[PDB]
RNA sequence: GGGGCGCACCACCGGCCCGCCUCGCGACCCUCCGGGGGGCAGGUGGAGUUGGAGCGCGCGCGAUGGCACCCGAAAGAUGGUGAACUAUGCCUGGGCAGGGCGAAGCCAGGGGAAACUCUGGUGGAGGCCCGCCGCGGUCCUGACGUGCAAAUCGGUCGUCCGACCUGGGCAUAGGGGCGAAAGACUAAUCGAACCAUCUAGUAGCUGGUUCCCUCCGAAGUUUCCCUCAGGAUAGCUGGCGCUCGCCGAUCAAGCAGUUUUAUCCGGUAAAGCCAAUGACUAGAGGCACCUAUUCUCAAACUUUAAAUGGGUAAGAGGCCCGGCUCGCUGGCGCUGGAGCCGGGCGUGGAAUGCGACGCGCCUAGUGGGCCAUUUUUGGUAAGCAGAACUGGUGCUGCGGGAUGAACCGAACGCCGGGUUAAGGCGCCCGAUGCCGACGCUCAUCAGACCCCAUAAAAGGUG
RNA sequence: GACGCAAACGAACCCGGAGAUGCCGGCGGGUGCCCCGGGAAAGAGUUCUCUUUUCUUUGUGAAGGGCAGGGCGCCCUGGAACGGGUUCGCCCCGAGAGAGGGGCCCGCGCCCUGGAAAGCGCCGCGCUGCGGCGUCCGGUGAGCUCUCGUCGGCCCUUGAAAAUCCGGGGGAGAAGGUGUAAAUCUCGCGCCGGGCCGUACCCAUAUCCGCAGCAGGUCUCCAAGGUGAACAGCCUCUGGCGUGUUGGAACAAGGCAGAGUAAGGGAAGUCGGCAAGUCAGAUCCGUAACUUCGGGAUAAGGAUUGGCUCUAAGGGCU
RNA sequence: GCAGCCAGCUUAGAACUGUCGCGGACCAGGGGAAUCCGACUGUUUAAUUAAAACAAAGCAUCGCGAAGGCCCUCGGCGGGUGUUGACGCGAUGUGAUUUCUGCCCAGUGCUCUGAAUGUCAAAGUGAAGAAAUUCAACGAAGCGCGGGUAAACGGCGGUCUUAAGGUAGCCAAAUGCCUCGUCAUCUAAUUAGUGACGCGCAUGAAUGGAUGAACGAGAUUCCCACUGUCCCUACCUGCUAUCUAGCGAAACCACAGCCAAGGGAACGGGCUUGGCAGAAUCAGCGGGGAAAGAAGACCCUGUUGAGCUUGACUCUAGUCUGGCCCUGUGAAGCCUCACUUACCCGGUGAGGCGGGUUCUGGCGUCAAGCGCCCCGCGGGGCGCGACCCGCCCCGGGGACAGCGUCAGGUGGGGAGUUUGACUGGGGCGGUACACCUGUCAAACGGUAACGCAGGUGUCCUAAGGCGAGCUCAGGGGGGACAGAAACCUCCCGUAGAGCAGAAGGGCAAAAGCUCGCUUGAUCUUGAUUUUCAGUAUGAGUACGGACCGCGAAAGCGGGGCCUCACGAUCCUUCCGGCUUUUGGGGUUUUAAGCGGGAGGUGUCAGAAAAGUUACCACAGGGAUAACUGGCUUGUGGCGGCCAAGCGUUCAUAGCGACGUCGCUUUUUGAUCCUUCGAUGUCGGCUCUUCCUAUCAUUGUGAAGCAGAAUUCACCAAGCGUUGGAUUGUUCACCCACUAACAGGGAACGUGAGCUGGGUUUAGACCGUCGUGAGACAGGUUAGUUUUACCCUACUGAUGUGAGCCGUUGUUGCAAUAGUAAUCCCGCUCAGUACGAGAGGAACCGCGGGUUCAGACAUUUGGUUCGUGCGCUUGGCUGAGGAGCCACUGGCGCGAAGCCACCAUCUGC
């Protein structure tokens, strides 16, 4: 057979992002003396929309305090901020909606959103709009704060982890149902080339392990083992269970 | 007319050498620690030996490895070149009459006790409608179909603000790309592009394989083979000889797809079942059976038993006699037996024919056969399928059967004369143009000769 | 006050602007074109009859100055309910309307410099270039384009970067000591320079690609009069052209096309209403089953349509 | 409060008016009632499939928190997703909305455990041994075991029964073979359509079920309207064809070109026997040249491929896991926790590490200030402001990730290859593939077929060897229980029993039975028979040499009474040998070798081996299938003979049982002779001729013929044999009509004649089947039908006896060839014959018609580019007038021509 289309996407030549009109990468303001001290004062400039994302970014303004500059951050816009409020980001950084500060100056069940998942690596987790995470526990004896992932999933990260407090803007997108594929077609048209997925049963046994035989049955268990081979990993790869549950 | 030395070669019997096996095991001069010998004999294995024949060169042919007689694949591999077509994506540009339905929003006026409703207008939303350009390409299965065109033309038709159309610049490259998925597209090439090379790839498979005359002349069968379109192998074929015989007296041997004589072999035809095994019909007698009869049968039944056929023997390699040898055999060195040696006796002791189809070596082709009389299996039968003997044919023309592969006659250098075969002799068309013999036969579908080109049961006061 | 003056020092560094923002709809301003009236001038066409007629020509570059016109969430005064202003739609208003008076931007429109000397039109003379006259005055528009605006609509779509240029913040610095100096973004003026490469032509029913002068393919710009809703079809002007690699003569069969026509019947043809026939535009009426209430729908089914002569209504301006 | 002036363009109404004509040209939806499928728009096989296929929104599942999921790369912990972060990315299924989505976790697959008993690599560990080595313990992942999971692949039965037994629904469906199901409806008639019925060959619930507005160049049925689709064709125009001037190819070609029969490679053009046969040509035409185009694409074969798939064979990338390696340090009880410096990751312009500014959408830029010091009031430096020290920039991991290297698992993701043969084509079946008996087999031997009837891959320590004794099968007479069969006994008993087995042979003091002694079923050499090449192996025979058994002995026995019961090289294994080598010697292990067994190749002289291809390719094959033709005629069709019987009686008016003889090639087979470098394949349409086995008509005979009607038979193919519904249909069935609605042939006539509906490429759907790719001899939908100008034949059109007193013309003759008419009705006969009636003819005569033939245009109708006349739309020449343009502008009428059973005439 042929090399089938999931394979194909990790060559990049036709699947790679369309990155063209986005306005950069969002993430939070590196740190540094300012935010393991204190904390630094920003002005919102302007909540901007990103191609290819659900969520707003805000164009927050700080000034550098080692040279006269006013530095642009590009932030994950958190619903309920505007445009003339002032961001603070730091360690003592009051408790309000759109402020950076630690985890573990964060009392258990505050709602955060562009979460670190490592001190350091300017935000990772809950990006997407709507979505957040919730501080659980702490524990000053090892500096490590339990946290609740969007996916329900509890991680243990570290206490040094910033978050901006809140929810992303832009929640509810999924809520609504889209009616026209054109609709569609201009939603993945800013983010990648993957919108029209051919189904592996109606391809041929050449371009899929699904395809062939007078109907379109998959023939085989659509569950796929994790040790698959590229190639062959098509279906539910590792499926624990299967079923309308 | 007798004797003899006997070449080469062949048959047989020995001797010896090496391997192996069995038997015999012993005292002894080579033991000098260790050890080497000890007629050993009887068998058997060996590409040995018993008075070398090879080596080199050349020539011819055969079977091989090589491009291997020539031309031919579908492929496989290595390296490379293409996204000017097209597929998708990216960037920057360009483009899409006039109408139709007419949504939110808004205005004003009616109805109502209120909740609120009703009407008109405004408004101009939509992968909305008609439709031009554009982009597509439904039907006519129209035109065309060596065309205008290696996909075009006409009318008709789909869509025509959207998942729209489109330029340029970019990106993805061959087991890779790309694919709203048709195995589609990737430069007229796609179920794996193109170019060059490996490569003159291999082919048990088609095709072709070049001057003459002369001579000889097949096989389609055996066994084996992942064989059954091919090979190996035997047979059939040719060539090369050679050993002789005739010369030197059918001298005689020897031989034979043939008889004769003698001697065996067989279980088919026929026959038989009142004989066995099995099948089967009918009465009859006796105290369903039992006995004597009876009808009808066998390929896997048979007492019996041919024709044709198979083997063997028809002499000097015989016959007769004597002596000798033996470890085998044993009442009996003659009891067997066999071997060795010598002597005696042609009236070569059936017919016919023939030089020995003698002894080798090398060897091509073939290994699809087909047909006829007879025999014979399966089948309703077949110009069917499968066998047996022989001939034919393939390979073969000629006379005849009009015609023809195979029937009939007869096989062939180039001719003249003669005469025939099979078949014919009204005319075509050589030959009855006989005063041919006797009879049969009338058909309003007559009849007219192997194979052979169809005719039956049943009928006629012809 | 918005902001204006020919200029009107100023670095490092910082801030911001322009470059630099999609598609669609409505409306408005301006050109171009088209149209109407001059009983307007200059030639020309017709003049059998009629036609104060028909046709053609009646113009001004860049840049600069001035002024219309358009735009402005720009300013000042002031204060709004009996709310008012206002658009086709909307929208706007004590975060300040209306009104009054200003300011700014765009002004591709008009006037002027250019600049009538040139260009067109007409007439005249000369020859084998010189002169004359004219180049005028208005009307408009559901008109068509282009353009500048404005207000919206649409996106789970937000519709580029950079070179370059500019403003501000900054006040580090520079300048002279009584008339000048430093400094000058003064289209105030003068002086000098601007190299290299492309540039013809075809651009398609004969200059490209398809082997060709191939009915194929190949990205754009400009675009008139009449009919009409129309960038439809049909006709005409400007421009182009000889009918698309040949002529002549016949008009048989059989073809291809004209989607030619055909009495009576009307799908009996045929696998099958294949084919083309019917219907068709517009106006006025009338529109079911079903439905996701959106539709179905131009459902279906009707009537009307010419020409001519009138009536009525729908405006603007002083 | 308007008067004056200016400015258009629409709308409504009315009169009048022409031939009731007017969106006059042009432009420009036929409509309705239903079914199926897909929701829609969109997309798709450039060059045969625009679709029901793809996509789609919606729905659902799966994976994944970044040291990650998915994927790329030869490789860098490089790259894509990712300028991303679960409202995300990645992998699948289903396919809008509505309505639901049942049951099954046994199987397969995925996944989760590890109170995990097994299986279990490398390394490490222990023991034995001179050591190589052997043995043992230990023993990861994975497997196994256990749980979960079906919107995972899939499945969802006849008291039996499993894993669940098809639930809601739906249906003779795009799915139902039987089948053209049954009923209803739709029509005169319906294999169609629709609605029902459902044990449904073989429906069914996200392999989604059911429904469904709107939509569709989708499939289907009906109705109205409409029409040349047809009845039934005709006329006109343009461009051609045609002729001409100029110009000027190609395909194709053994030679060629009249037929009938014959035979032949079984369908000649040439050959045979006949018919016969006259230059040179034109326009047509499509019968033939088994016409051309193309080394059949179907089929088979080849030890030729390729695409693709799996539970094929053998590997592999990746991935999982273990050991070693970078890999060090500290502590505690191999393991755990710590250490940082290896290594790794993240951040940053490496900007503050360790220890001692929240009151606003301002502003913040190289230090003010102070202290100290140096230049000649101008100038400069330094320090504090801005604390000191420090060894690693700051975080997060950490000797774990990860790299390297072996080891185990997984691995159709990928690679390579295979996937027997025989065979009345292949496939399926079977084994005729290695063997044995009887027969075939034709009296030596041998002798074939997918001939016949069978057997074999074993069995036996005796069922081998030997000796002795005994006699069997069966029948009869008898004899307590005891009988048709228990046991005793007598007589008869050629074997008719038994001998392991198939069958044949052989066997009576044996070869059978019984008994007691045994291991000749042992060790060896060669010869030899059978199969045979006269090779091997297997299976046999006769000996010789050993050592034995049994018997008193002669003797018998080296397996089975005989004919069957079996296996090369290589390799492994075992046994045997004072006997070899282990090589520079010696010793000892090991290894090798020699001799003999065993381990096995059943395709049995012995490869290691699953499919599919309708996407297919190549070399070939008429050695071999699917047509026609040929042979044959079982079968099909048709006709006889005999005469039991039927016919009230009466065999034979008409029939014909049991039997039997034929014919025919319009059935189907059998065969495989022709054709695979191609003979275009079903049906219909069209058109011609032929056969008779005669439906009708003409002339007859017969009757269980009164008439009428009908039946049987004869001469006889002259003439006719229809219009429709359904189905692609030949074949059926029905509706009507009719004198009758007879059956056939001609390559199962006829595709360069047509039409493609069907079959029979590639698209796609359903059902069943398969794990799958795919298959269906099941259904369904869409799917390029190319060329003639050559030679004949035929159709017409020129011309033709090259020699002559012939040339030329008129009127004619005529061989030969073609040939043509046909059937019906009405009146009359006649309500008559006939008959009891009911009913009910015929000849002559008369008047018409059907089908056909040949004409013809007076009439009617059609056509009209005589572009003849009128009218008229848009435009154009200023207008009138007169005209033109729009490939014939349109409309009405229309001459002449041509033309219609749509008018007319004639047919012996
Ligand atoms: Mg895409
Ligand atoms: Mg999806
Ligand atoms: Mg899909
Ligand atoms: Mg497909
Ligand atoms: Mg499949
Ligand atoms: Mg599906
Ligand atoms: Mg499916
Ligand atoms: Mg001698
Ligand atoms: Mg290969
Ligand atoms: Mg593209
Ligand atoms: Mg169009
Ligand atoms: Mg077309
Ligand atoms: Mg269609
Ligand atoms: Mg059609
Ligand atoms: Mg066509
Ligand atoms: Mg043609
Ligand atoms: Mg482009
Ligand atoms: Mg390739
Ligand atoms: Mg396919
Ligand atoms: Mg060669
Ligand atoms: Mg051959
Ligand atoms: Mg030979
Ligand atoms: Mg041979
Ligand atoms: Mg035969
Ligand atoms: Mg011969
Ligand atoms: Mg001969
Ligand atoms: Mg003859
Ligand atoms: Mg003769
Ligand atoms: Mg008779
Ligand atoms: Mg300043
Ligand atoms: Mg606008
Ligand atoms: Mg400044
Ligand atoms: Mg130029
Ligand atoms: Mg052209
Ligand atoms: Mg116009
Ligand atoms: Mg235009
Ligand atoms: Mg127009
Ligand atoms: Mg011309
Ligand atoms: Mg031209
Ligand atoms: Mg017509
Ligand atoms: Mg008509
Ligand atoms: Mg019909
Ligand atoms: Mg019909
Ligand atoms: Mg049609
Ligand atoms: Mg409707
Ligand atoms: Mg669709
Ligand atoms: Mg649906
Ligand atoms: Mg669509
Ligand atoms: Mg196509
Ligand atoms: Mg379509
Ligand atoms: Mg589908
Ligand atoms: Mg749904
Ligand atoms: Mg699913
Ligand atoms: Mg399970
Ligand atoms: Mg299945
Ligand atoms: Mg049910
Ligand atoms: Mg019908
Ligand atoms: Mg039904
Ligand atoms: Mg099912
Ligand atoms: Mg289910
Ligand atoms: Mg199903
Ligand atoms: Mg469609
Ligand atoms: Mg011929
Ligand atoms: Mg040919
Ligand atoms: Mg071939
Ligand atoms: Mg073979
Ligand atoms: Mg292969
Ligand atoms: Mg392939
Ligand atoms: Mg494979
Ligand atoms: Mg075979
Ligand atoms: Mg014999
Ligand atoms: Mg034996
Ligand atoms: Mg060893
Ligand atoms: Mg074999
Ligand atoms: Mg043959
Ligand atoms: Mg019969
Ligand atoms: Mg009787
Ligand atoms: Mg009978
Ligand atoms: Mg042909
Ligand atoms: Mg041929
Ligand atoms: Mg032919
Ligand atoms: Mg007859
Ligand atoms: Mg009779
Ligand atoms: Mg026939
Ligand atoms: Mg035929
Ligand atoms: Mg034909
Ligand atoms: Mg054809
Ligand atoms: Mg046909
Ligand atoms: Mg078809
Ligand atoms: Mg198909
Ligand atoms: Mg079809
Ligand atoms: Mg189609
Ligand atoms: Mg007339
Ligand atoms: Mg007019
Ligand atoms: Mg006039
Ligand atoms: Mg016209
Ligand atoms: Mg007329």
Redesign the pocket.
Same mark, same amino acid.
């Given at each position: 057979?042929?090399?089938?289309?999931? !394979?194909?996407?990790?060559?990049? &030549?036709?699947?790679?992002?369309?990155?063209? $009109?986005?306005?950069?990468?969002?993430?939070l303001r590196?740190?540094?003396?300012?935010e393991?001290?204190?904390?630094?004062?920003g002005?919102?400039?302007?909540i901007?929309?990103?191609? /290819?994302?659900?969520?707003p970014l805000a164009k927050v303004?700080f000034?550098?305090?080692?040279?006269?500059?006013?530095?642009?951050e590009l932030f994950?816009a958190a619903e309920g901020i505007?445009?003339? !409020?002032?961001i603070?980001c730091?360690?003592?950084? !009051?408790?309000?909606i759109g402020?950076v500060?630690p985890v573990g100056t964060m009392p258990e069940g505050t709602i955060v959103?562009?979460?670190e998942?490592?001190?350091?690596?300017?935000?990772?987790?809950?990006?997407?709009?709507?979505?957040?995470?919730t501080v659980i526990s702490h524990n000053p004896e090892?500096?490590?704060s339990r946290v609740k992932?969007? &996916?329900?999933?509890k991680?243990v990260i &570290?206490s040094?982890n910033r978050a901006v407090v809140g929810?992303?803007a832009? /929640?509810?997108?999924?809520?609504?149902?889209?009616?026209?594929?054109?609709?569609?077609?201009?939603?993945?048209?800013?983010?990648?080339?993957?919108?029209?997925?051919?189904?592996?049963?109606?391809?041929?046994?050449?371009? $899929?392990?699904?395809?062939? /035989?007078?109907?379109?049955?998959?023939?085989?268990?659509?569950?796929?083992?994790?040790?698959?081979?590229?190639?062959?990993?098509?279906?539910?790869?590792?499926?624990?269970?299967?079923?309308?549950?």
């Open positions: 057979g042929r090399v089938i289309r999931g !394979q194909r996407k990790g060559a990049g &030549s036709v699947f790679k992002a369309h990155v063209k $009109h986005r306005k950069g990468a969002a993430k590196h740190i540094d003396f300012a393991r001290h204190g904390y630094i004062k002005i919102v400039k302007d901007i929309h990103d191609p /290819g994302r659900g969520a303004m000034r550098d305090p080692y040279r006269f500059k006013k530095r642009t994950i505007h445009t003339g !409020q002032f603070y730091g360690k003592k950084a !009051q408790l309000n402020n500060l959103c562009c979460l998942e490592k001190p350091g690596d300017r935000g990772k987790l809950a990006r997407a709009s709507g979505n957040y995470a090892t500096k490590k992932l969007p &996916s329900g999933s991680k &570290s040094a929810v992303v832009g /929640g509810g997108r999924i809520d609504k149902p889209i009616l026209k594929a054109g609709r569609a077609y201009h939603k993945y048209k800013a983010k990648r080339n993957c919108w029209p997925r051919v189904r592996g049963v109606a391809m041929n046994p050449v371009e $899929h392990p699904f395809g062939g /035989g007078n109907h379109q049955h998959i023939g085989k268990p659509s569950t796929i083992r994790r040790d698959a081979p590229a190639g062959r990993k098509v279906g539910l790869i590792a499926a624990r269970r299967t079923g309308r549950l």
